[PDB]
Design an enzyme around this catalytic site. Structure first.
Site, mmCIF file in Angstrom:
data_model
loop_
_atom_site.group_PDB
_atom_site.id
_atom_site.type_symbol
_atom_site.label_atom_id
_atom_site.label_comp_id
_atom_site.label_asym_id
_atom_site.label_seq_id
_atom_site.Cartn_x
_atom_site.Cartn_y
_atom_site.Cartn_z
ATOM 1 N N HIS A 121 -3.753 3.274 -2.034
ATOM 2 C CA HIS A 121 -4.368 2.495 -0.601
ATOM 3 C C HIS A 121 -4.006 3.343 0.403
ATOM 4 C CE1 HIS A 121 -0.415 0.715 -1.933
ATOM 5 N NE2 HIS A 121 -0.012 0.980 -0.513
ATOM 6 N N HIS B 194 3.351 6.661 6.500
ATOM 7 C CA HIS B 194 2.168 6.826 5.821
ATOM 8 C C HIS B 194 1.062 6.397 7.110
ATOM 9 C CE1 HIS B 194 3.098 2.477 5.715
ATOM 10 N NE2 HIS B 194 1.977 2.292 6.299
ATOM 11 N N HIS C 59 -2.926 4.681 8.380
ATOM 12 C CA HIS C 59 -4.156 3.910 8.364
ATOM 13 C C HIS C 59 -5.169 4.665 9.173
ATOM 14 C CE1 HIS C 59 -1.622 0.593 6.662
ATOM 15 N NE2 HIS C 59 -0.742 1.092 7.291
ATOM 16 N N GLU D 265 -4.207 -0.209 13.143
ATOM 17 C CA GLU D 265 -4.044 -1.836 12.688
ATOM 18 C C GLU D 265 -3.737 -2.419 13.800
ATOM 19 O OE1 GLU D 265 -1.107 -1.407 9.245
ATOM 20 O OE2 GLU D 265 -3.007 -2.134 8.335
ATOM 21 N N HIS E 44 2.872 4.878 10.458
ATOM 22 C CA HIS E 44 3.941 3.727 10.421
ATOM 23 C C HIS E 44 4.935 4.705 9.705
ATOM 24 C CE1 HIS E 44 0.861 0.083 10.295
ATOM 25 N NE2 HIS E 44 1.279 0.542 11.282
ATOM 26 N N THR F 168 1.870 -4.722 6.527
ATOM 27 C CA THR F 168 0.571 -5.042 6.716
ATOM 28 C C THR F 168 -0.295 -4.804 5.414
ATOM 29 O OG1 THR F 168 -0.053 -2.900 7.456
ATOM 30 C CG2 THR F 168 0.639 -4.324 9.113
ATOM 31 N N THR F 169 0.195 -4.476 4.245
ATOM 32 C CA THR F 169 -0.350 -4.749 2.993
ATOM 33 C C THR F 169 0.438 -5.479 1.983
ATOM 34 O OG1 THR F 169 1.353 -2.781 2.068
ATOM 35 C CG2 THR F 169 -1.105 -2.416 2.937
HETATM 36 NA NA NA Z 1 3.585 1.182 -0.198
HETATM 37 ZN ZN LIG Z 2 1.133 0.798 7.292
#
Ligand code: NA
Ligand SMILES: [Zn+2]
Length: 258
Positions: free
Chosen positions: A62, A92, A94, A104, A117, A196-197
């Site tokens: 992801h 990571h 997005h 986000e 993030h 947020t996941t």
């Molecule tokens: Na993760």
């Molecule tokens: Zn994130």
């Protein structure tokens, strides 16, 4: 995992497996800059990353995470709205399929090309897995990326992406200094929110920096070449791995500045 960012398994479906998706303190949110309250009692952030030990970069299907050694206080975040010492575990991003989307959080409904993030956990809980079950367990520093000039300190990340193109691939990734990803100013907004996941747990103090960093078109293009799928499966490009803004509900966003 069955969840993802497509038509049939994307964020508007997540509540069926993770009912907390419709909870009271979900993230991300839109930061309305004229409704955010200046709080003169908020301290400066203290970012101590001089002793950071990066280990590995991994495609988890992801996003890609850069992982750090968090077995001692080597890269920590203190101060700001935090009590106690939070240790960096991974960062990571997005990002979007186009430069006008990908972040986000949004700021007065403005979307940025991507959002970084840096994820840290409260050392009073002993490990990351215990920290995610506490309302003050995680602190995530969020930094916006806009497209303009290249960021030299990101290039080491973008060069290795070729080697972790598909889900499950990992690579040694040592001696990366995350200080090269920080903007000049550490002024910030903060509010209580969630991962947020999935599992979307409500354990996050968000600290979102006001000043974006700039990256080049070519740098973000390389993010867009990664795949969601595993090797030998049909190609699905890893783009638009962002969750849309969620209702603020009964929360106030505070600003460290005016
Ligand atoms: Na993760
Ligand atoms: Zn994130």
């Amino acid at each position: 995992h069955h969840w993802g960012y497509g038509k049939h398994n994307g964020p508007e479906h997540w509540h069926k497996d993770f009912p907390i998706a419709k909870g009271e303190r979900q993230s991300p949110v839109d930061i309305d800059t004229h409704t955010a309250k200046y709080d003169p009692s908020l301290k400066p952030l203290s970012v101590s990353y001089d002793q950071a030990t990066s280990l590995r970069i991994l495609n988890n299907g992801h996003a890609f995470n850069v992982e750090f050694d968090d077995s001692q206080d080597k890269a920590v975040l203190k101060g700001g709205p935090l009590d106690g010492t939070y240790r960096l575990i991974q960062f990571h991003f997005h990002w979007g399929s186009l430069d006008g989307q990908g972040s986000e959080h949004t700021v007065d409904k403005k979307k940025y090309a991507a959002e970084l993030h840096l994820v840290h956990w409260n050392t009073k809980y002993g490990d990351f897995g215990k920290a995610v079950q506490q309302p003050d367990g995680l602190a995530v520093l969020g930094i916006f990326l806009k497209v303009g000039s290249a960021k030299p300190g990101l290039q080491k990340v973008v060069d290795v992406l070729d080697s972790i193109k598909t889900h499950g691939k990992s690579a040694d990734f040592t001696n990366f200094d995350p200080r090269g990803l920080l903007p000049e100013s550490l002024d910030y907004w903060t509010y209580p929110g969630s991962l947020t996941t999935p599992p979307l747990l409500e354990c996050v103090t968000w600290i979102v920096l006001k000043e974006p960093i700039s990256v080049s078109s070519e740098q973000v293009l390389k993010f867009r070449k990664l795949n969601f799928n595993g090797e030998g499966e049909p190609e699905e490009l890893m783009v638009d791995n962002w969750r849309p803004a969620q209702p603020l509900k009964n929360r106030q966003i505070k600003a460290s500045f005016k």
